[PDB]
Amino acid sequence: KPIWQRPSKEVEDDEYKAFYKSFSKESDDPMAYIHFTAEGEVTFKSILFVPTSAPYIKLYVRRVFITDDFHDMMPKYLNFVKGVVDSDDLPLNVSRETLQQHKLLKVIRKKLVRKTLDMIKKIADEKYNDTFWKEFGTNIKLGVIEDHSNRTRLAKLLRFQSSHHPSDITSLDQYVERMKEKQDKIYFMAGSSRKEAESSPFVERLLKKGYEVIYLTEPVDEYCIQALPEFDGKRFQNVAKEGVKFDESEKTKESREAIEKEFEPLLNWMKDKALKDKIEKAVVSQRLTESPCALVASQYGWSGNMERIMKAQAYQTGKDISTNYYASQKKTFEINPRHPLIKDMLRRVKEDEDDKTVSDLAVVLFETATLRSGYLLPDTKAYGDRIERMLRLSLNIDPDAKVEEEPEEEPEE
Amino acid sequence: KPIWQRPSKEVEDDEYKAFYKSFSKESDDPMAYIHFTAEGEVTFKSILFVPTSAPYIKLYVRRVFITDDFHDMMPKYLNFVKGVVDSDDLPLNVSRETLQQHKLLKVIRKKLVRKTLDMIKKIADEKYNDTFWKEFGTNIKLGVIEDHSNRTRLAKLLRFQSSHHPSDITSLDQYVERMKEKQDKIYFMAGSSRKEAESSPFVERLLKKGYEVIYLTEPVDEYCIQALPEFDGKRFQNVAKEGVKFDESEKTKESREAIEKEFEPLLNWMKDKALKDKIEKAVVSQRLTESPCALVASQYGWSGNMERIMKAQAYQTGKDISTNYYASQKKTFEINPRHPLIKDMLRRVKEDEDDKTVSDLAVVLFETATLRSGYLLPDTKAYGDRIERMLRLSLNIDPDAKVEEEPEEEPEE
């Protein structure tokens, strides 16, 4: 009597563990397993396993070994799941092309997934984060993207890093638990490493104000969170895009609105002259603590991280998505109203609006902010020359009429 | 009597063009074809085609159709070659697992390739660059890397852009032809785009001096040129690495050597203090015209371009090659001996060696040169802050004792 045909309650814990090693060697235990029998439209018995490493599903029709080459048994992201499936409904006396393309095949596929996820839902707690996540956490994320129907089920299985603790991973449910009263957004920051994301300008105020930010350090991470509309009735919000709010009070609103009136000629100065055709608009930032300014993308446009991931993949694989869409779109330049540099810029503009010193500074500041916002710098040659021109003021060396002078004394050599 | 069994001289040009469309539709002509019979160790007849786009090799044993599922017939880079193969030596009646792993199979494969390249060698001249190159140029570059034995045959087929002309591609032979008398290196610069490679500081003097520099703007490009040791007795030289020479004369040598004695206390100053543990050594640059300084990688180290490509692929796929080797190696910092800023630096160091103003400037200059050299900036948060510190000097705003003040007047909000 095959291991999978006996009742669930009659099989020893040891026998399952012995069964797993029989078709994979390695001589070590699986992370988990479930033995179930399916009822309803399609009847079949099965045992599915979760190995302990990534570094294969046995099909049986009416108890007769058919194959295990069927790679479309599990969806892309569950290709690590090993086990047996013993149907008694499928056409036994047919071809392998016919059988793989049958009506009941797509049905069994879905039932296997829904059970696999039930198994994973029950992996202890301390063991989940310490084992399963560091091994197949990527698959869970891939699933959120691909498996639309089990999306909310998978959402719970997600684990990320957050501003709550320097290293520890957190679940989405845990985040929601820590949230502030009026807060209704799950704030997150995407990047190349935790150190980059936490250093970023976009999280500054949210942190100081006491909010929690999730750090996405993986390449797939932003796509994942992107394919997840809501979670427990809370919508997601990329701190590097437009969408951050701070409810406050009436007297607080009065102040901020009055600050925006004050800086208005400076914001129009950047929009119309200093950075014309460089930014979409200039506004007073609400997310900045100590940074002078940052570049913020539109709600459905590309973040700094997105632009990199896209360009990288389009360069390695694609055919130059240069004039793509929201790839070459201007960003919203946000400035910190309480920054010494921004305040001088306001005053000096209301005085001499055609002051090239401010104009050329605004550019250097913008381009530095371009790098700090995570976006690629268009022309590193020009930027380096603008730093050079300004560097030479900090010394004395005649800006224009010297970078020619000695650099062209070379005809002697 | 099949199309491939008749003599080469007896088959009409039209009939070949007709034969191509019969197994691929599309209703349009191929770019080139060759009909040949093989003599020697293994005998077979074959017609190979080069399609006009990229967006399949018919195997016959003793005129009997066998299959077209054999994807290991051509090497990876020639997967675009469509055609027929009619052997009479192969085991006719044997399994497909057997026949694919046979002795003579590896032999036929090499003959097919050597003939494919003979076909491509004969693609007119005007038609080669305008059509074939912009379609399969990449495969040629992959071949140089993969196909060792046909490497010198493939090298000639390579086409790149160069400083000789704004857009026109050039062959390697053409480059050799334009070379100077004492020149014995093929100078090239690797980048993300042409505009980037030509803007680079590394090409400055070589260009002024009259030398020609090849620009590599594709990801695979530097990997290609790297796997090619010599070409027509000329070794290659990456303008961004150590290796550039300028033969000159004795009185020229006297001057340069006398200059290296002059800047020595500034070179030791950078190495031992201002940039201690940042650079490997500071030297007097011979490749610079108008740039103040640049980072130069070792001979077989990673160039700026290399670093970017390696890091990207190691992020999209690999597991953080952070503690690799020549991934985290310090570069050689080269200064232009005739730059107003460098000259002030030398003078200001011989006087006050512990002048923090110079010490702090040399870092901003080094970091700007880090970006200009095509290298990744380690901590953009720090860099932005250093620019900010210096920006506020060009206004007045108390550097240390202000970036605290107003940026911490927020507790009122």
CA distance, residue B192 to nearest chain A CA (Å): 9
Of A37, A61, A56, the residue nearest A47 (C-alpha):
A37
- The pair of structure tokens assigned to A306 is 């997105």
Helix H, strand E, coil C: the string for A391-410 is HCCCCCCCCCCCCCCHHHCH
Which of A368, A388, A397 faces B344 most closely, judged by CB atoms? Answer: A397
Q: Give me the sign of the Cα torsion angle B35, B40, B43, B48.
A: negative
Q: B255 — contact with chain A (CB < 8 Å)?
A: yes
Q: What is the 3-state secondary structure (H, E, C) of chain A?
A: CCHHHCCHHHCCHHHHHHHHHHCCCCCCCCCEEEEEEECCCCCEEEEEEECCCCCCEEEEECCEEEECCCCCCCCHHHCCCEEEEEECCCCCCCCHHHHHCCHHHHHHHHHHHHHHHHHHHCCCCHHHHHHHHHHHHHHHHHHHHHCHHHHHHHHCCCEEEECCEEEEEEEHHHHHHHCCCCCCEEEEEECCCHHHHHHCHHHHHHHHHCCCCEEECCCCHHHHHHCCCEECCEEEEECCECCCCCCCCHHHHHHHHHHHHHHHHHHHHHHHHHCCCCEEEEEECCCCCCCCEEEEECCCCCCHHHHHHHHHHHHHCCCCCCCCCCCCCCEEEEECCCCHHHHHHHHHHHHCCCCHHHHHHHHHHHHHHHHHCCCCCCCHHHHHHHHHHHHCCCCCCCCCCCCCCHHHCHHHC
Contacts of A364 in chain B (CB under 8 A): 387, 391
- Sheet (strand A293-296) strand order: A279-284, A331-335, A293-296
Tell me which chain B residues have a C-beta less than 8 angstroms from the C-beta of A391.
341, 361, 364-365, 368, 390
> How far is CA A189 from each of CA A34, A140, A201, A364, rounded to the nearest angstrom?
37, 20, 10, 25
Interface test with B, best of A253, A295, A338 (most B CBs within 10 A): A338
Instruction: For A346-377, give one letter per residue: b (16+ CB within 10 A) or e.
Output: bebbeeeeeeeebbebbbbbbbbbbbbbbbee
What is the strand order of the sheet B234-238 is part of?
A: B165-171, B159-162, B214-216, B185-190, B234-238, B230-231
Resolution of this entry in Å? 3.2
Nearest CA in chain A to B308: A312
Dihedral class, residue B27 (left if φ above 0, else alpha if ψ from -120 to 50, else beta): left
Q: B290 and A387 in contact by Cβ < 8 A?
A: no
Q: Which two tokens stand for residue B349?
A: 């160091």
* Token pair 């709550």: residue: A164
Q: Are B173 and B159 in contact (CB under 8 A)?
A: no
Task: List phi, psi (to 5°) of A2.
Answer: -55, 145
How was this entry determined? X-ray
Q: Which two tokens stand for residue B348?
A: 């200001």
Domains and CATH numbers, chain A: 1-154 (3.30.230.80), 155-413 (no CATH)
Which chain B residues have a beta carbon less than 8 Å from that of A387?
A: 364, 368, 387
With a CB-CB cutoff of 8 Å, which residues 119-178 of chain A face chain B? none
| B249 within 8 A of B219, measured Cβ to Cβ | no
Q: Which 8-state DSSP code applies to residue B29?
A: -
Q: 10 Å Cβ neighbour count for B364?
A: 18
| Strand order across the beta sheet in which A64-67 lies | A32-38, A44-50, A82-87, A57-61, A64-67
Measured from the Cβ of residue A133, the count of other Cβ atoms closer than 10 Å reads: 19
**In chain B, residues 295-314 whose CB comes closer than 8 Å to chain A:** 312-313
Strand partners, A294: A334
Across-strand partners of A159?
A171
Sheet containing A234-238: give its strands across. Answer: A165-171, A159-162, A214-216, A185-190, A234-238, A230-231
Measured between alpha carbons, how far is A308 from A40 in angstroms, rounded to an integer? Answer: 48
Q: Classify residue B344 as left (phi > 0), alpha (psi -120 to 50) or beta.
A: alpha
The helix/strand/coil state of B361 is helix
Determine the Cα–Cα distance for residues B242 and B350; give it in Å rounded to an integer: 28
Q: Does A278 touch chain B (CB under 8 A)?
A: no
Chain B residues 378-407 within an 8 A CB cutoff of chain A: 379-381, 383-384, 387-388, 390-395, 397-398, 402-403, 405-407
Q: Strand, coil or helix: what is B326?
A: coil
Q: How many A×B Cβ pairs under 8 Å?
A: 143
Q: What is the rounded CA–CA span in Å between residue A169 and residue A135?
A: 14
* Beta-sheet strand order (sheet of B64-67): B32-38, B44-50, B82-87, B57-61, B64-67
B377: nearest CA partner in chain A: A371
Which residues of chain B have a CB within 8 Å of the CB of A290?
Answer: 403, 407
Residue B276, both tokens: 């201690």
